[PDB]
Amino acid sequence: NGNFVFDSPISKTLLDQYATLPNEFKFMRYQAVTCEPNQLAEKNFTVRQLKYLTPRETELMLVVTMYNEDHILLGRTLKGIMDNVKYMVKKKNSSTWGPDAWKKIVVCIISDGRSKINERSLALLSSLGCYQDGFAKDEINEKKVAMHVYEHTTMINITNISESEVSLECNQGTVPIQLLFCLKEQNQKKINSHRWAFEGFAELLRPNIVTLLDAGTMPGKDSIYQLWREFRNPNVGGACGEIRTDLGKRFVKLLNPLVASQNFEYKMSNILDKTTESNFGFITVLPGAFSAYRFEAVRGQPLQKYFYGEIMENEGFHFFSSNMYLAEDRILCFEVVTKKNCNWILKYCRSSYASTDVPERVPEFILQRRRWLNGSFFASVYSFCHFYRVWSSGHNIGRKLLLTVEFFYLFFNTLISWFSLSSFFLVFRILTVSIALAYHSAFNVLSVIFLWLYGICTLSTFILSLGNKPKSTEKFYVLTCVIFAVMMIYMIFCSIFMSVKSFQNILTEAFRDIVISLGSTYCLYLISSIIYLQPWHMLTSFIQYILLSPSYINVLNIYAFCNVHDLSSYDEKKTGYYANVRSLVIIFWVITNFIIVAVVLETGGIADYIAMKSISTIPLMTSKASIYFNVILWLVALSALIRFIGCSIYMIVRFFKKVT
Amino acid sequence: NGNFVFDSPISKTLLDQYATLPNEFKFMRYQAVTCEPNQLAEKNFTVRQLKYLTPRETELMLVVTMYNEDHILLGRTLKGIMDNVKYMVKKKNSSTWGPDAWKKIVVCIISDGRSKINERSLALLSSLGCYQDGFAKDEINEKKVAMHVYEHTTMINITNISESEVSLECNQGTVPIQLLFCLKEQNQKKINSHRWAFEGFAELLRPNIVTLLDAGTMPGKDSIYQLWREFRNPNVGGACGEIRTDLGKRFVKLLNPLVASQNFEYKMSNILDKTTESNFGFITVLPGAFSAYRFEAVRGQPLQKYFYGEIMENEGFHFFSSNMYLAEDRILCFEVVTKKNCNWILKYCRSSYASTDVPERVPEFILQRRRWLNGSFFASVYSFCHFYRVWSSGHNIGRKLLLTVEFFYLFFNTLISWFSLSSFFLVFRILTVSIALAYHSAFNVLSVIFLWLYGICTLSTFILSLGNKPKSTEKFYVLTCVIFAVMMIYMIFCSIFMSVKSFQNILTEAFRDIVISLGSTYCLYLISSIIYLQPWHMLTSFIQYILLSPSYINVLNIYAFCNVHDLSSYDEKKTGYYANVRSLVIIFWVITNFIIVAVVLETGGIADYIAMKSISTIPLMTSKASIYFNVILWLVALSALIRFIGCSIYMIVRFFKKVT
Ligand SMILES: NC(=O)OC[C@H](O)[C@@H](O)[C@H](N)C(=O)N[C@H](C(=O)O)[C@H]1O[C@@H](n2cc(CO)c(=O)[nH]c2=O)[C@H](O)[C@@H]1O
């Protein structure tokens, strides 16, 4: 049909394994694609699934993305998938998953560039019988090729994963898998790969559900099946399973403090936040590593906004229309909820889990968090600045009201997180000075030293994040984290010391109240973990996270706000606009935080002004500090309480549904 | 000789003008150079000057550098040169400059790249008969050409410069000029352009004196001749004239405040600093726009250090060995003074002047000053960190001692300038608070507002200089300068107000002393200007400079320290080292200044610590502020006094030499 195709018989050894035979098992198809993803249909590109005498009906289509992963991570992910399909076909009382479930299940593996792909994994892929060199063409009839499509259905299954080798076997218990290997001619953006999946192949495949995976992610032994079960309600359009750190063999990785704190964080985010948000019906972010979308729900407006942005735009740049790309993923969720005349919702099913690797060194950790913080902030402001769209959807009145209250709660979250830095120093200074004034022994020298340490660390972090890169200077970041850990240790010691002394004296008072409130939040965390029935997470070095806490409050935030856009003709004007908007958020951040600090501690000449106005007719401490300190933990207790109540509701309805 | 040469007869019209005739007048030589500058000799490249039957003896060789200048600036510079040579030949009583003195002089014009050269000026050059297209070759016998050499001796002289057109004429009063047009095949560093002059052509030309000019610089009607006269002393090896800001026709540019302040600065630097430094015998910097070097003195070690750097170096990077390039020009001066077994000195002759254009908009002004500030700081630290070399030279003991004391004085200059920012804010705060405490009327609100304004401006400048570029954001810099001008206005008003009130009361006291000292420095400036016999410069909007002063103290310095290296395999390691060293000077700067501010104003918890130590047994102001404020103007008066004394000595010896 004017296009280049090539069929090469499957490896004779692989054919012998298959024997251990209809045409699709014995051969590999190769197609060369030279168009952008949205011409696969009418430019006469096809797949085997439609070439049979009776076209195959796709019930699930699976996508995984590779950039440079070695064969271990990919092997693990496909081990999970093949196990899950084996359980799928093993089901008896399921028409969707009977003797030939894989007939309705095809797995697509989206590479990114031959140059950066790890041939170390191409070895395994060739072992599976879906990849052979020799017939790769970079340009066809003066048309540059866009992607290579390799297409085979194997019989070999992965069965064990050792730290070094990948165990594959072919027996009578194996289950056929339909493969779709796509190799982008050159390395491209992950969103482009998603477009190749959604805007492209999915259109021909006509799938009922599309699940986004990620190389190195472990589906549970039945997590995919459970996720599919969640879609029996005709209202859900997206869903996501709990994601936990893969830790290490015999939990060895749990030695690393960073891994320990990250583990506790992953657990919390999946115990309070997601259950609370899924109670209302809107989830802030579906993890890109593991998510599922009903295809018909997402087509149209969502993919438009995701791949193109707000088309309605003049020649000049606008804030949203040229900044929404930093919330690339989150916007999808928003767009499905408030679609016109459609009542789609999102759901969080806790019993489908996935274990993933995490960054292990400070540079990679920071370079990862940066994207997440920027995306979260931009998506939150975009959602709150356009919430009225929810009233233009097809929801009933109750859903609409619940979505409204949820939006207000989320904006309260983003605002309280915006002024976190000011509270951090404001609290530390108040407690340190309070105790030093109280007892006089040796906190006096300590107070001065700690203040200087915090100032130098805060400044140096600003300078380094604005000018330098994390890769060049790794030692200083580790030292900064250590210093913040020491400061947090001293803060806790002061708190407990004052609490004990005040208890003896009653045998100040607001600090007895603060220890009440801190005990309250810790006990509520414990109860929340107890309800979920995974209470060893609190024992997973949660204290290690507490020590690293200050770092996240005074290091991740500064870097995230100091590297907003990652800058490097129309291009120069765009770069100038990006640089201008980057250096304008930071100044606002510092000024707004310092306004609170000045109002409370009475620095910046305010004390001098007050004292000398009274002369017209300075103190060491005022009641303002006491009031502020009471208020901050008032708020912390409130947040913990509302989140605990939400978690209980989610678990209660989940259990009640199980009872029914 | 295995090389490509090409002779084309001079324009017939130009030939007719010449008639209005020996061979060198009637033809243009063209040579193609394909080696690096230090093979012009032994790779058999020659020039006409040596091709005559009796080789011509070069008494002066002149170099001018072009990057993109239009025909006006170049035309002005060559107008100056031809006038000066006309006066040179017009001289009667001289053993050297006779009727054929022009033959002993050759002018070399070093371009930089065909791509960026202004063909708008190539028009004028072709008019002069030293440039014709058609026979340009970019590569000769698989060897890339390095430079095009065009060679002619004209008879036309420039006679008037209108804002639009260049008046050229050919009459009986014109004087022949020997030209050497060297258009670099590709644009490159100006130092590389100089490398072609000194390490290259000069070796064949064997000149007695080489004068560095710059496109757009006006030699005086006799400045070149005077500069040559300065070399009759067999000890001088370099000398420089005096640069005057171009006020423009009827001082039209003067209206611009920036031009006015720059004019006053150019005058001062040439009235106190250079005369004082030339009294001892070492000049900090010979202006690249206008300078003169005795060739034999500079050959050897100086060009080695200038073009290559400290060869003695390991694989790793060292501070000096890889940072000296930022003081590219200044080092030359140092190297001539402390040459081994040579007693060369530098001299400053005031009566040779040169008028040049200056940057007129804030972005270009800042992008210019940056290089000067970085070069000055690095050269000063390099000189003071290696001063013992002076004792290894061939000077007598008296010269050696004078050079020692001068080096100490220069390091005192660089140190006092290093802690200028801290003094700026420290003084402003002390005066504003002092007055506000004094009188209570409305300085109270003003004091608080001014403090906040300074803080925001200082912060915003830090952020913008670290992250952004001056080109993108021009408006904010102008606003910053305006704000600093307003702050300086208020500072002056407070000073005079307190002085007047204290005078009435005596009809605090340290501030009566400060007004004494400020009157002292202003009157010493006036007397210094009076002695030099150019006292209209004080009337050239010197007050406009005073208003812009704060800006230079709190804007030029921050940008200079925040863009030290201009960063953008061995290259990546080098870039990492540059980025590391860049972000380490800044932190030192801030910490050292804030240490002074904390010690004096007693901020940073020091007051809290003192008060609560006394509790173990805070004020609004202490005597420390009074002591510091007295000391700072003590120092300012000292500097003004020593500089005035030096200026007088220079003028006295100059006059005495004239008397003798
Ligand atoms: N909560 C949660 O997300 O889990 C953690 C999450 O799994 C991470 O830990 C996980 N290691 C991870 O980074 N996955 C990436 C992602 O999808 O974001 C995958 O995208 C692919 N990719 C990415 C880029 C740069 O964006 C590219 O240029 N090309 C490209 O191909 C690549 O295959 C990468 O693996």
Ligand SMILES: NC(=O)OC[C@H](O)[C@@H](O)[C@H](N)C(=O)N[C@H](C(=O)O)[C@H]1O[C@@H](n2cc(CO)c(=O)[nH]c2=O)[C@H](O)[C@@H]1O
């Ligand atoms: N006190 C004092 O110096 O006077 C002020 C001084 O004259 C300035 O105002 C004067 N406008 C000026 O900038 N002259 C430059 C200089 O010599 O530094 C000349 O160097 C040339 N050049 C420069 C670069 C970049 O460095 C290049 O890449 N290529 C290149 O050819 C260029 O011809 C430029 O004109």
